[PDB]
Design a protein around this nucleic acid. Structure first.
Lengths: 154, 395
RNA sequence: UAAAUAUCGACUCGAUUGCGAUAGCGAACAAGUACCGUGAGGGAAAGUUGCAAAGGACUUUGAAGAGAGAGUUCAAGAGAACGUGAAAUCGCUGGAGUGGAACCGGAGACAGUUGAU
RNA sequence: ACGUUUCCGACCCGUCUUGAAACACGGAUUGCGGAGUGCUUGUCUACUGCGAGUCAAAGGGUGUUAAAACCUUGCGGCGAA
RNA sequence: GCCGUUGCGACAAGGUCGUAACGAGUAGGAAGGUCGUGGCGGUUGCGUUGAAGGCUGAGCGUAGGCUCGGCUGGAGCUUCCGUCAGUGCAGAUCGUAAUGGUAGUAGCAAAUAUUCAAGUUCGAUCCUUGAAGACUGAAGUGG
RNA sequence: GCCUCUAGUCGAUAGAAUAAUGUAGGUAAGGGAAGUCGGCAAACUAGAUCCGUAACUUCGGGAAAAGGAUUGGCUCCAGUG
RNA sequence: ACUGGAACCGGUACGGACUCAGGGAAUCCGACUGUCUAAUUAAAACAGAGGUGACAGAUGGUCCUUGCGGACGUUGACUGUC
RNA sequence: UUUCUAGCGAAACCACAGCCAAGGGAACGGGCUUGGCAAAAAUAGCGGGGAAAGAAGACCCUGUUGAGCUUGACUCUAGUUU
RNA sequence: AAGCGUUGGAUUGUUCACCCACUAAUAGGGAACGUGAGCUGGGUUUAGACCGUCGUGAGACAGGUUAGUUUUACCCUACUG
RNA sequence: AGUGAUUCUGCGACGCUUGCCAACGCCAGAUCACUCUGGUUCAAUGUCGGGGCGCUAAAUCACUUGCAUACGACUUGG
């Protein structure tokens, strides 16, 4: 439903994967995905698993209001990072789908690199929260569209 | 409107900002004025705060109510093992202050001295000073070293020796040594440079830097307490029990105008771990290493014949055993136990009677500092308590 | 005591310099409906795939949502919340600026754009 | 030219107010909607037809691109005292 | 020098031109508008070889605005003459719909408490079984 | 009031750590209301047996006035059908 | 089943947790029990028993209803209302 | 609790924005004039300022604007007496 | 010459005032009569209630008395780290 | 070899040049009249290729330590 923000340099030796209306916090997944820019596929998967295991941190470069500090943050030349597990899981699933697409098109899976990655906000879901003095306020979820293009690197 | 009743402000504003010390080691911000007549000597030393005890001494202070009477006084033990001289550096005056002109390192540097240049010494290749060491046994390197020595002798106005502590002899976890620059006082610049050259790679004992009944200065970092409120950080009056939103605060943090919070108001923040320089700590005893015949009973006196060392029963709590040379200072010393203290010679011309008073120790408390110690030695404890079930079963 | 007269409330018809989905009746649609109040009563939002469902068979990864191919079609970037698809707001790629505001008028320079029988 | 950099100038609009950049009020942002109208009655002014006249009402006659157009007034309105 | 207003004037024209002086403006009053919008009676044309609508380069006009180019879109639109009007928005704590910074922030802290092994599952602090540890404590968290 | 049996629950988003400020509990040397508008808040007292109990009084009360002593376990003794 | 007494025993202590008024001397107000401003005032405010006064013997008194008619009244001064 | 982490996730408020001294100004400036100055991005606190937010001042005045209540205000009226 | 000090209390809501005591001294003032998103709420200053005077009455009284809800920081800056 | 407010000096040695007279004696020189050339003006740095000697490290995460600590940070060890 959502078109790719970019097009591969050479569509022959490249694959794409997409996901729409994923119920994962957009800001967290956007920071996690931006952390994956330019990584080889295996490095990206290892990084996501390390994030799940708390062995590596995702640096929060844009949505870092109130985020805490950590020692692992030094490796990204910043001061605020986190470990979004749900975002890591969703990105891992997307990368698995892209790997399957590359295998389907007959590409060497061990030379794929993340040429392009993007996260966009999607339509919100509506819920309610009840406040003092008999008031009702919105309790909204912020899902995302995720898209990735892998390219075969020589 | 003026405050109804006057009261002095809380705290000393010249000790602000109350921030964590930039460094763990105490920085010597000034050295004693150099007198060319006196013999060459060092002006500072490094030690570790081992712990506190109390002593009984006969007081000689004419006109005082405790003249010729024994008094109990609390003292702090600072373990000060000999320091190794690893380098010599000199400073030249310029229109913007003294400036380091050059540094000459000893041909052989201890592994624990070279550790100080590392954060991952064990994981590294330990290449520090490897090429410099080869200069001393090379024709050109020797010429460069001699030229550096000539520059020091010819241009510098003050000379400093780089000295480092020895950590292996302490049989403790840390192996990385502490390096410090100690200015050399006495004699001309040429004599200072020659003395430093002779003492390169050599050990210096504390008794050659300090003397008995002498007032010195302690420079270091105080005990840390973390983030603290105004009541504990600045000692402001607690607000009434009926206060809403807390009483451990400062009620008014400034008037309407100027429409900003001044830097003189008390605020919550870091308390402790501040750099400090306490002056006029008197030396009550300089004791030798307990591992030498001279220091076998460095915890005893002329009137207390019991053969004991300075270490209290059960060891110094949370510190260990003091088996090296030590200094017994009167009163409190900044920092907790195990803290590295920089001892410095006084910059003042001492003139008060307490500066020249002779200290005559009659007894040194050695009982356990964990709990309430009843005995001064394990031998005394066993003699008093007789034989136990353990001994009976051992028989 | 009929006719000439009044009246679209009811039934059936014809028109218009009226509105064109926030307009026109509240209601172009399962509208006096959903929903609200004990009750009298109050009362919405909601039009649009395509000529024709031909509404995406089949292969492939995943538990699935979903995606990568493929097919239908004038066209699917018309794919079901589907004609068009604005502004605010937001993400990416590349360039450039970046000392407690930023924007703006006048005058050059640079980059850039454009014209030369 | 709503890009960058320089030199000069440069306070946030609307409003009430003697006086607003105001420590006066409204204004977070964008789309769409949003306010001197209809009619009766006067008066002046401009234009058109006729002119001591002018307009004719309700109505009637006709008219089938028939709610139009066309014809039609002893009398009525205004004017002529 | 150029623009326009005013006065005067020339010319067979609701127009062109010449000439001298002039040009501040709130409230307010007039004039011009081939400025713009929607109808009607007529007139002039364009359109599936791409209308309206939408995004945005080359120009035009003092301005209101307009013309053309490129892309999207798929069925209407338009010149000029009269005449009519539900005819122009930045505000009205304006109506309605949508969206931001705040912000991944405030926060999800009353009612003592959970742990081990296994089962099922793609997936288990939270579902189920067993063992243990606690609670309501018969004016109960029971029936 | 506290603990337990039958029966029923472990449902209150979880993990790490235990800075400041906080909410709710527990203490505090010597002094003892000097705090404060004000003893606000907290502390003090308390069950049961024996003794003792003032002014005043509507003779009913005040009265649990005030204020003292005892209280556990074990082995026995006596009384009460 | 409860009551009284005796010896012995320990230990910081015996209503060992738990449960449960601090006490006294006075002044002002209200007699007391009670009621009240739901959601800022629980009081000295209201009520109260007691006291006094007013009207009413029924063809009456006090009230309601547009009217018809109705309530106190299944009442009758030791009653009824004010 | 706050704090840090995983998951989840609002609202008030918002002309534009946020370093000061003096001056003058609607007589108490974040912007204006002259000076002091001026270096990323951030975490935890804080209550000086933002004449901070909540609400078209419940105080006072005006209005030929009301309403509750009172009476020796004006004009009427149920009822009652004759 | 403002570097540094200029106190503990009884009464009163009090600012003031007065007294007791110590003291080197018990100096005077500003900062929106500094300081309520710092507290408190004793006073003032709604609605309940009482008295005196005033008023025919509803009601009035810088006359006295009693009881009477003190909200929000997570934003910018400043300050503290 | 000297200079300490770090570069700059003096002395050599070696290279590459550098003056005047015969003498404008002799060759060459011209872009049409000027429009950014000194008629290739000078500097600063980045990067990519060839060579000449020349060298063969560290932080950081994760564990650990507790003198430190809200989280970062700090102090230790392999």
């Amino acid at each position: 439903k959502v078109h790719y923000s970019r097009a591969p340099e050479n569509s022959t030796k490249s694959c794409k994967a997409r996901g729409s209306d994923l119920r994962v916090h957009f800001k967290n997944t956007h920071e996690a995905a931006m952390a994956l820019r330019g990584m080889p596929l295996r490095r990206a998967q290892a990084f996501l698993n390390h994030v799940k295991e708390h062995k590596e941190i995702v640096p929060f470069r844009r949505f870092h209001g109130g985020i805490g500090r950590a020692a692992q943050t030094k490796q990204w030349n910043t001061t605020q990072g986190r470990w979004p597990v749900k975002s890591a899981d969703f990105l891992l699933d997307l990368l698995k789908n892209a790997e399957s697409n590359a295998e389907y098109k007959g590409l060497d899976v061990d030379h794929l690199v993340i040429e392009h990655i993007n996260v966009q906000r999607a339509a919100k879901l509506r819920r309610r929260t009840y406040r003092a003095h008999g008031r009702i306020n919105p309790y909204m979820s912020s899902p995302c569209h995720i898209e990735v293009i892998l390219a075969e690197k020589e | 409107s003026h405050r109804k009743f006057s009261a002095p402000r809380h705290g000393h504003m010249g000790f602000t900002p109350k921030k964590r010390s930039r460094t763990y080691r105490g920085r010597i911000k000034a050295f004693p004025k150099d007198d060319k007549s006196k013999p060459i000597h060092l002006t500072a030393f490094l030690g570790y705060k081992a712990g506190m005890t109390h002593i009984v001494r006969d007081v000689d202070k004419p006109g005082s109510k405790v003249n010729k009477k024994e008094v109990v006084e609390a003292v702090t033990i600072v373990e000060t093992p000999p320091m190794v001289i690893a380098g010599v550096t000199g400073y030249v005056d310029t229109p913007q202050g003294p400036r380091a002109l050059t540094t000459i390192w000893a041909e052989h540097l201890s592994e624990e001295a070279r550790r100080r240049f590392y954060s991952n010494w064990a994981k590294s290749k330990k290449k520090a000073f490897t090429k410099y060491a080869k200069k001393w046994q090379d024709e050109d390197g020797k010429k460069l070293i001699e030229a550096d020595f000539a520059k020091l002798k010819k241009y510098c106005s003050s000379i400093r020796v780089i000295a480092h502590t020895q950590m292996k002899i302490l049989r403790r976890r840390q192996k990385k040594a502490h390096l410090v620059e100690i200015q050399v006082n006495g004699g001309t610049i040429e004599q200072k440079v020659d003395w430093a050259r002779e003492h390169l790679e050599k050990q210096v004992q504390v008794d050659t830097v300090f003397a008995q009944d002498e007032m010195i200065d302690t420079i270091g970092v105080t005990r840390g307490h973390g983030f603290k409120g105004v009541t504990s950080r600045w000692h402001t009056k607690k607000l009434p029990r009926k206060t809403h939103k807390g009483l451990r605060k400062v009620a008014c943090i400034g008037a309407w105008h100027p429409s900003r919070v001044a830097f003189t108001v008390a605020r919550a923040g870091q308390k402790g771990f501040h750099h400090r320089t306490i002056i006029n700590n008197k030396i009550y005893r300089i004791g030798k290493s307990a591992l030498t015949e001279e220091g076998k009973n460095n915890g005893s006196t002329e009137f207390d014949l019991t053969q004991k060392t300075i270490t209290p029963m059960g060891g110094f709590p949370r510190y260990g055993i003091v088996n090296q040379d030590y200094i017994m200072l009167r009163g409190a010393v900044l920092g907790p136990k195990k803290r590295l203290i920089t001892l410095r010679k006084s910059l003042i011309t001492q003139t008060k009677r307490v500066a020249h008073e002779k200290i005559n120790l009659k007894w040194i408390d050695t009982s356990s500092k964990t709990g309430h110690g009843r005995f001064q030695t394990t031998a005394e404890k066993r003699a008093f308590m007789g034989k136990l079930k353990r001994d009976f079963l051992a028989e």
